[PDB]
């Protein structure tokens, strides 16, 4: 099919996404930047979608977190999420797609702004939300590895799939884990979708970037970086550690598996055959910036190797003394 301006798309229905793309790129993402609203929109895809259980209910990727915001945003596990919900609401009202579609579309468009990013498949036509998600379906950073894997598995994800989705933490920061240090990133490159998250979580924890003993927080290897207890434990767990390590300096695998697993997540509670493939609307992301490296001042001996079958790859360190990671704007 051909849109009004001559551009090809696989299905004529997708043409309506282009004005939405332009609007959100200019007015939500600060001119197609990989900034705070991109990170929060990506986070929102998960907090909407994971509200899905065969036993316990929930409509999955259905826009419920917007359509029933006063209910869902008050769940403890959704702390901090109301900013992005409130920011996206006007766009949904202004345009002609469902809240469920918009959440996934904004997430995909956002990721495409980030150097190293990947194009996530996007499908159009999610019905409006029918009911609020049940509470207690979103994993928390203080939940045990087994609890997290159980919940993600309940929603449909194998343990290796959870590792692949956690590539998102490569472009991520925390405001509520340690409120004394808002906007503290999970890796040294929160503006680049890269393997640094998987490297740096493997390093032995040395310190606290803010205060000690926050719930859901582990020791970080670097000033200016925060480590979730969940990520700490997943990098070291037999079920996930070898997959975790395999992401290190493997940009193609990170991209391939993130795109496929995000697509799966985006379709929780949905039937792909009842939707329209509009993947070709997502822009080409910028190329990777930077190479895979240990932080300056670190060596292989600082890695806590957790994959028995395969040794950690022989990365080199950035030159110079240990340095701190800048907070994110
Ligand atoms: C598997 C269990 C997971 C846990 C326990 C977890 C936990 C967290 C926590 C505690 C934060 C910081 C929130 C704050 O204090 O501000 C965070 C941020 C974030 N999460 Fe995860 N998460 C998980 C999986 C995921 C998944 C599957 C995605 C997929 C998109 C995701 C995307 C993000 C992003 C993009 C941020 C950064 C938000 C920002 O910088 O504004 N997370 N996560
Ligand atoms: Ca939902
Ligand atoms: Ca990164």
Short mmCIF file of C-alpha atoms and ligand atoms in Angstrom, two decimals:
data_model
loop_
_atom_site.label_atom_id
_atom_site.label_comp_id
_atom_site.label_asym_id
_atom_site.label_seq_id
_atom_site.Cartn_x
_atom_site.Cartn_y
_atom_site.Cartn_z
CA UNK A 1 0.00 0.00 0.00
CA UNK A 2 1.02 3.63 -0.49
CA UNK A 3 0.45 6.48 1.94
CA UNK A 4 -0.57 10.02 0.95
CA UNK A 5 3.06 11.13 0.58
CA UNK A 6 4.05 8.17 -1.62
CA UNK A 7 5.69 6.15 1.16
CA UNK A 8 5.09 2.39 1.04
CA UNK A 9 3.65 0.42 3.96
CA UNK A 10 2.56 -3.23 3.96
CA UNK A 11 -1.01 -2.42 4.98
CA UNK A 12 -3.04 0.71 4.26
CA UNK A 13 -4.26 0.83 7.87
CA UNK A 14 -0.73 1.74 9.03
CA UNK A 15 -0.76 5.14 7.29
CA UNK A 16 -2.48 6.73 10.28
CA UNK A 17 0.59 5.98 12.42
CA UNK A 18 2.81 8.51 10.65
CA UNK A 19 1.19 11.67 12.07
CA UNK A 20 1.29 9.98 15.49
CA UNK A 21 5.00 9.23 15.03
CA UNK A 22 5.70 12.85 14.10
CA UNK A 23 3.71 14.18 17.04
CA UNK A 24 5.33 11.98 19.67
CA UNK A 25 8.81 12.46 18.22
CA UNK A 26 8.45 16.23 18.47
CA UNK A 27 6.25 16.58 21.55
CA UNK A 28 6.94 13.58 23.77
CA UNK A 29 10.52 12.65 22.85
CA UNK A 30 12.01 16.17 22.55
CA UNK A 31 12.79 15.86 18.85
CA UNK A 32 13.48 12.15 18.47
CA UNK A 33 15.89 11.95 21.41
CA UNK A 34 16.70 8.93 23.59
CA UNK A 35 15.89 10.77 26.81
CA UNK A 36 13.82 10.41 29.96
CA UNK A 37 10.46 10.04 28.20
CA UNK A 38 11.86 7.27 26.00
CA UNK A 39 13.10 5.37 29.06
CA UNK A 40 9.78 5.80 30.86
CA UNK A 41 7.75 4.85 27.78
CA UNK A 42 9.79 1.66 27.49
CA UNK A 43 9.18 0.95 31.19
CA UNK A 44 5.47 1.54 30.62
CA UNK A 45 5.29 -1.20 27.96
CA UNK A 46 6.25 -3.73 30.65
CA UNK A 47 4.06 -2.35 33.42
CA UNK A 48 1.03 -2.44 31.11
CA UNK A 49 1.78 -5.80 29.47
CA UNK A 50 2.84 -7.97 32.41
CA UNK A 51 -0.57 -7.64 34.06
CA UNK A 52 -1.47 -10.96 32.52
CA UNK A 53 -1.99 -14.36 34.17
CA UNK A 54 -3.95 -17.48 33.22
CA UNK A 55 -4.67 -18.18 36.89
CA UNK A 56 -4.96 -14.65 38.26
CA UNK A 57 -6.38 -12.61 35.36
CA UNK A 58 -5.37 -9.38 33.62
CA UNK A 59 -5.70 -8.35 29.97
CA UNK A 60 -2.00 -7.92 29.28
CA UNK A 61 -0.97 -5.32 26.73
CA UNK A 62 -4.36 -3.65 26.74
CA UNK A 63 -3.77 -0.06 27.84
CA UNK A 64 -5.32 -0.83 31.25
CA UNK A 65 -2.61 1.11 33.07
CA UNK A 66 -3.86 4.29 31.34
CA UNK A 67 -7.59 3.49 31.14
CA UNK A 68 -7.68 2.45 34.81
CA UNK A 69 -4.80 4.65 36.00
CA UNK A 70 -6.26 5.62 39.39
CA UNK A 71 -6.36 1.90 40.18
CA UNK A 72 -3.12 0.64 38.61
CA UNK A 73 -0.82 3.60 39.33
CA UNK A 74 -1.50 3.11 43.06
CA UNK A 75 -0.12 -0.44 43.04
CA UNK A 76 3.18 -0.38 44.99
CA UNK A 77 5.01 -2.02 42.06
CA UNK A 78 3.93 0.85 39.81
CA UNK A 79 5.54 3.53 41.98
CA UNK A 80 6.81 6.34 39.77
CA UNK A 81 4.78 5.30 36.74
CA UNK A 82 2.12 8.02 36.88
CA UNK A 83 4.34 10.68 35.28
CA UNK A 84 4.51 8.82 31.97
CA UNK A 85 0.88 7.69 32.13
CA UNK A 86 -0.16 11.31 32.59
CA UNK A 87 2.16 12.44 29.79
CA UNK A 88 0.81 9.89 27.29
CA UNK A 89 -2.89 10.46 28.02
CA UNK A 90 -3.29 13.61 25.86
CA UNK A 91 -1.66 11.90 22.89
CA UNK A 92 -4.07 8.97 23.13
CA UNK A 93 -7.02 11.39 23.30
CA UNK A 94 -5.75 13.44 20.35
CA UNK A 95 -5.12 10.48 18.07
CA UNK A 96 -7.29 7.61 16.98
CA UNK A 97 -5.63 4.47 18.36
CA UNK A 98 -6.27 2.54 21.57
CA UNK A 99 -4.30 3.11 24.75
CA UNK A 100 -2.84 -0.38 24.38
CA UNK A 101 -1.59 0.34 20.86
CA UNK A 102 -0.20 3.74 21.88
CA UNK A 103 1.82 2.38 24.78
CA UNK A 104 3.50 -0.21 22.56
CA UNK A 105 3.92 2.22 19.65
CA UNK A 106 5.56 4.88 21.82
CA UNK A 107 7.87 2.24 23.29
CA UNK A 108 8.96 1.03 19.88
CA UNK A 109 9.42 4.54 18.46
CA UNK A 110 11.36 5.55 21.57
CA UNK A 111 13.79 2.62 21.43
CA UNK A 112 14.41 3.48 17.75
CA UNK A 113 15.84 6.83 18.89
CA UNK A 114 18.60 5.22 20.92
CA UNK A 115 22.05 4.46 19.50
CA UNK A 116 22.38 0.68 19.38
CA UNK A 117 18.60 0.33 19.36
CA UNK A 118 16.55 -2.21 17.44
CA UNK A 119 13.25 -1.98 15.55
CA UNK A 120 10.60 -3.77 17.59
CA UNK A 121 7.78 -5.35 15.56
CA UNK A 122 4.56 -3.35 15.95
CA UNK A 123 0.99 -4.52 15.47
CA UNK A 124 -2.10 -2.31 15.30
CA UNK A 125 -5.59 -2.98 16.61
CA UNK A 126 -5.62 -3.80 20.34
CA UNK A 127 -9.14 -3.31 21.68
CA UNK A 128 -9.78 -0.80 24.47
CA UNK A 129 -9.07 -2.12 27.97
CA UNK A 130 -11.92 -4.13 29.50
CA UNK A 131 -10.80 -4.15 33.14
CA UNK A 132 -7.99 -3.04 35.44
CA UNK A 133 -5.07 -5.37 36.00
CA UNK A 134 -5.14 -7.32 39.24
CA UNK A 135 -2.51 -6.00 41.71
CA UNK A 136 0.69 -7.97 42.47
CA UNK A 137 1.48 -9.05 38.89
CA UNK A 138 4.45 -6.72 38.32
CA UNK A 139 7.77 -8.15 39.61
CA UNK A 140 9.64 -6.11 42.23
CA UNK A 141 13.42 -5.69 42.61
CA UNK A 142 13.31 -7.26 46.09
CA UNK A 143 11.46 -10.37 44.88
CA UNK A 144 13.53 -13.56 44.83
CA UNK A 145 14.92 -14.84 41.51
CA UNK A 146 12.54 -17.77 41.78
CA UNK A 147 9.60 -15.44 42.41
CA UNK A 148 10.50 -13.23 39.45
CA UNK A 149 11.04 -16.18 37.12
CA UNK A 150 7.79 -17.72 38.36
CA UNK A 151 5.77 -14.57 37.59
CA UNK A 152 7.43 -13.96 34.22
CA UNK A 153 6.95 -17.64 33.42
CA UNK A 154 3.31 -17.39 34.46
CA UNK A 155 2.93 -14.56 31.93
CA UNK A 156 4.63 -16.77 29.32
CA UNK A 157 8.40 -16.05 29.45
CA UNK A 158 11.15 -18.62 29.91
CA UNK A 159 14.11 -17.60 32.08
CA UNK A 160 16.31 -16.84 29.05
CA UNK A 161 13.50 -14.61 27.73
CA UNK A 162 13.58 -12.62 30.96
CA UNK A 163 17.30 -11.98 30.42
CA UNK A 164 16.58 -10.78 26.89
CA UNK A 165 13.89 -8.36 28.07
CA UNK A 166 16.23 -7.02 30.72
CA UNK A 167 18.37 -5.52 27.93
CA UNK A 168 15.98 -2.60 28.56
CA UNK A 169 17.99 -1.85 31.69
CA UNK A 170 20.80 -0.79 29.36
CA UNK A 171 18.84 2.46 28.88
CA UNK A 172 17.47 2.91 32.35
CA UNK A 173 17.70 4.77 35.64
CA UNK A 174 15.98 4.63 39.05
CA UNK A 175 14.25 7.41 41.00
CA UNK A 176 12.55 5.44 43.78
CA UNK A 177 14.97 2.65 44.70
CA UNK A 178 17.14 5.25 46.44
CA UNK A 179 15.18 8.55 46.50
CA UNK A 180 18.26 10.41 47.76
CA UNK A 181 19.79 9.89 44.31
CA UNK A 182 17.10 10.13 41.64
CA UNK A 183 18.04 9.45 38.02
CA UNK A 184 20.85 7.04 38.85
CA UNK A 185 21.41 4.65 35.87
CA UNK A 186 21.72 0.84 35.83
CA UNK A 187 24.69 1.05 33.45
CA UNK A 188 27.38 3.56 32.47
CA UNK A 189 25.62 4.25 29.13
CA UNK A 190 21.94 4.89 29.84
CA UNK A 191 21.71 6.68 26.48
CA UNK A 192 23.05 3.69 24.52
CA UNK A 193 21.36 0.35 24.00
CA UNK A 194 24.43 -1.81 24.50
CA UNK A 195 25.94 -4.68 26.51
CA UNK A 196 27.36 -2.53 29.32
CA UNK A 197 24.40 -3.41 31.55
CA UNK A 198 25.28 -7.11 31.30
CA UNK A 199 28.97 -6.47 31.97
CA UNK A 200 28.66 -4.09 34.85
CA UNK A 201 26.12 -6.19 36.75
CA UNK A 202 28.66 -9.04 36.66
CA UNK A 203 31.30 -7.02 38.51
CA UNK A 204 31.72 -7.54 42.25
CA UNK A 205 29.66 -4.99 44.20
CA UNK A 206 31.82 -2.54 46.14
CA UNK A 207 29.70 0.31 47.38
CA UNK A 208 26.38 2.14 47.59
CA UNK A 209 25.93 5.12 45.25
CA UNK A 210 23.63 6.72 47.81
CA UNK A 211 22.52 5.19 51.10
CA UNK A 212 22.96 1.62 52.30
CA UNK A 213 20.29 -1.03 52.69
CA UNK A 214 17.51 0.29 50.44
CA UNK A 215 14.88 -2.33 49.70
CA UNK A 216 15.51 -3.99 46.33
CA UNK A 217 19.03 -2.55 46.05
CA UNK A 218 22.40 -4.29 45.92
CA UNK A 219 25.96 -3.00 46.13
CA UNK A 220 27.08 -1.29 42.93
CA UNK A 221 30.57 -1.57 41.40
CA UNK A 222 30.59 2.13 40.44
CA UNK A 223 29.84 5.50 41.94
CA UNK A 224 26.93 6.96 40.00
CA UNK A 225 25.45 3.57 39.13
CA UNK A 226 22.73 1.71 40.99
CA UNK A 227 22.28 -2.06 41.04
CA UNK A 228 18.96 -3.80 41.59
CA UNK A 229 19.05 -6.85 43.83
CA UNK A 230 17.01 -8.60 41.12
CA UNK A 231 19.64 -7.89 38.44
CA UNK A 232 22.42 -8.76 40.88
CA UNK A 233 20.88 -12.17 41.53
CA UNK A 234 19.78 -12.91 37.94
CA UNK A 235 23.33 -12.38 36.62
CA UNK A 236 24.51 -15.04 39.08
CA UNK A 237 21.69 -17.56 38.99
CA UNK A 238 22.22 -20.94 37.29
CA UNK A 239 19.01 -20.50 35.28
CA UNK A 240 20.05 -17.17 33.75
CA UNK A 241 23.78 -16.59 34.30
CA UNK A 242 25.06 -18.25 31.13
CA UNK A 243 22.49 -16.41 29.03
CA UNK A 244 23.33 -13.17 30.85
CA UNK A 245 27.05 -13.59 30.07
CA UNK A 246 26.30 -14.46 26.44
CA UNK A 247 24.93 -10.94 25.91
CA UNK A 248 28.34 -9.45 26.74
CA UNK A 249 29.82 -7.78 23.65
CA UNK A 250 27.10 -9.41 21.56
CA UNK A 251 25.20 -6.46 20.14
CA UNK A 252 23.51 -8.50 17.39
CA UNK A 253 22.10 -11.01 19.88
CA UNK A 254 20.99 -8.24 22.24
CA UNK A 255 19.11 -6.58 19.39
CA UNK A 256 17.65 -9.74 17.87
CA UNK A 257 16.39 -11.24 21.13
CA UNK A 258 15.14 -7.95 22.57
CA UNK A 259 13.07 -7.25 19.45
CA UNK A 260 11.53 -10.72 19.34
CA UNK A 261 10.84 -10.91 23.08
CA UNK A 262 9.45 -7.36 23.22
CA UNK A 263 7.13 -8.34 20.39
CA UNK A 264 5.93 -11.29 22.46
CA UNK A 265 5.43 -9.04 25.50
CA UNK A 266 3.61 -6.43 23.45
CA UNK A 267 1.08 -9.09 22.41
CA UNK A 268 0.28 -10.50 25.85
CA UNK A 269 -3.49 -10.86 26.10
CA UNK A 270 -3.73 -10.36 22.34
CA UNK A 271 -4.05 -12.44 19.18
CA UNK A 272 -1.55 -11.40 16.51
CA UNK A 273 -3.81 -12.74 13.75
CA UNK A 274 -6.50 -10.23 14.76
CA UNK A 275 -4.07 -7.30 14.41
CA UNK A 276 -2.33 -5.57 11.51
CA UNK A 277 1.43 -5.65 10.99
CA UNK A 278 2.68 -2.06 10.94
CA UNK A 279 6.30 -2.83 11.76
CA UNK A 280 7.63 -0.94 8.74
CA UNK A 281 6.62 2.38 10.30
CA UNK A 282 9.31 2.15 12.98
CA UNK A 283 12.39 4.18 11.98
CA UNK A 284 15.90 2.80 11.60
CA UNK A 285 17.80 3.34 14.84
CA UNK A 286 21.19 5.08 15.02
CA UNK A 287 24.25 2.88 15.01
CA UNK A 288 25.92 1.65 18.17
CA UNK A 289 28.19 4.13 19.92
CA UNK A 290 31.20 2.80 21.82
CA UNK A 291 32.74 -0.65 22.27
CA UNK A 292 32.24 -3.23 25.01
CA UNK A 293 34.63 -2.61 27.90
CA UNK A 294 35.26 -3.11 31.58
CA UNK A 295 34.98 0.20 33.43
CA UNK A 296 38.26 2.06 33.88
CA UNK A 297 40.21 0.69 36.84
CA UNK A 298 38.66 -2.77 36.63
CA UNK A 299 40.12 -6.09 35.49
CA UNK A 300 38.78 -9.59 34.74
CA UNK A 301 39.49 -10.51 38.35
CA UNK A 302 36.70 -8.09 39.33
CA UNK A 303 34.16 -10.13 37.38
CA UNK A 304 32.14 -12.62 39.41
CA UNK A 305 32.00 -15.42 36.86
CA UNK A 306 28.76 -17.38 37.14
CA UNK A 307 28.67 -19.42 33.93
CA UNK A 308 30.41 -22.73 34.57
CA UNK A 309 30.35 -23.80 30.93
CA UNK A 310 31.99 -20.72 29.39
CA UNK A 311 34.53 -18.23 30.76
CA UNK A 312 33.74 -14.52 30.74
CA UNK A 313 35.05 -12.89 27.53
CA UNK A 314 38.43 -11.12 27.63
CA UNK A 315 37.25 -7.51 27.52
CA UNK A 316 39.70 -4.69 28.02
CA UNK A 317 39.18 -1.84 30.48
CA UNK A 318 38.72 1.81 29.57
CA UNK A 319 42.02 3.59 30.28
CA UNK A 320 42.72 5.49 33.48
CA UNK A 321 41.50 5.46 37.09
CA UNK A 322 38.08 4.46 38.35
CA UNK A 323 35.52 7.17 37.54
CA UNK A 324 31.92 7.96 38.43
CA UNK A 325 28.84 7.73 36.23
CA UNK A 326 27.03 11.07 35.68
CA UNK A 327 23.38 11.15 36.73
CA UNK A 328 20.90 11.32 33.86
CA UNK A 329 18.93 14.53 33.14
C1 LIG B 1 12.07 -8.67 35.41
C2 LIG B 1 11.89 -7.92 36.50
C3 LIG B 1 12.11 -6.39 36.51
C4 LIG B 1 12.31 -5.69 37.63
C5 LIG B 1 12.37 -6.26 39.06
C6 LIG B 1 12.47 -4.30 37.28
C7 LIG B 1 12.69 -3.27 38.16
C8 LIG B 1 12.92 -1.95 37.82
C9 LIG B 1 13.12 -0.88 38.76
C10 LIG B 1 13.09 -1.04 40.29
C11 LIG B 1 13.30 0.25 38.08
C12 LIG B 1 13.56 1.65 38.69
C13 LIG B 1 12.24 2.39 38.95
C14 LIG B 1 12.54 3.62 39.77
O1 LIG B 1 12.87 3.47 40.97
O2 LIG B 1 12.45 4.74 39.21
C15 LIG B 1 13.24 -0.06 36.67
C16 LIG B 1 13.40 0.83 35.64
C17 LIG B 1 13.21 0.56 34.31
N1 LIG B 1 12.71 -0.63 33.79
FE1 LIG B 1 12.82 -2.49 34.78
N2 LIG B 1 12.37 -4.18 35.90
C18 LIG B 1 12.12 -5.45 35.39
C19 LIG B 1 11.93 -5.72 34.05
C20 LIG B 1 11.82 -4.79 33.04
C21 LIG B 1 11.36 -5.06 31.71
C22 LIG B 1 10.89 -6.44 31.20
C23 LIG B 1 11.38 -3.92 31.01
C24 LIG B 1 10.96 -3.84 29.52
C25 LIG B 1 10.73 -2.69 28.88
C26 LIG B 1 11.89 -2.87 31.89
C27 LIG B 1 12.13 -1.55 31.57
C28 LIG B 1 12.62 -0.57 32.40
C29 LIG B 1 13.12 0.70 31.95
C30 LIG B 1 13.23 1.18 30.49
C31 LIG B 1 13.51 1.47 33.21
C32 LIG B 1 14.12 2.89 33.28
C33 LIG B 1 13.02 3.94 33.42
C34 LIG B 1 13.63 5.33 33.39
O3 LIG B 1 14.87 5.44 33.34
O4 LIG B 1 12.87 6.34 33.42
N3 LIG B 1 12.15 -3.45 33.11
N4 LIG B 1 12.99 -1.42 36.55
CA1 LIG B 2 -2.43 -3.99 31.15
CA1 LIG B 3 23.63 1.12 28.06
#
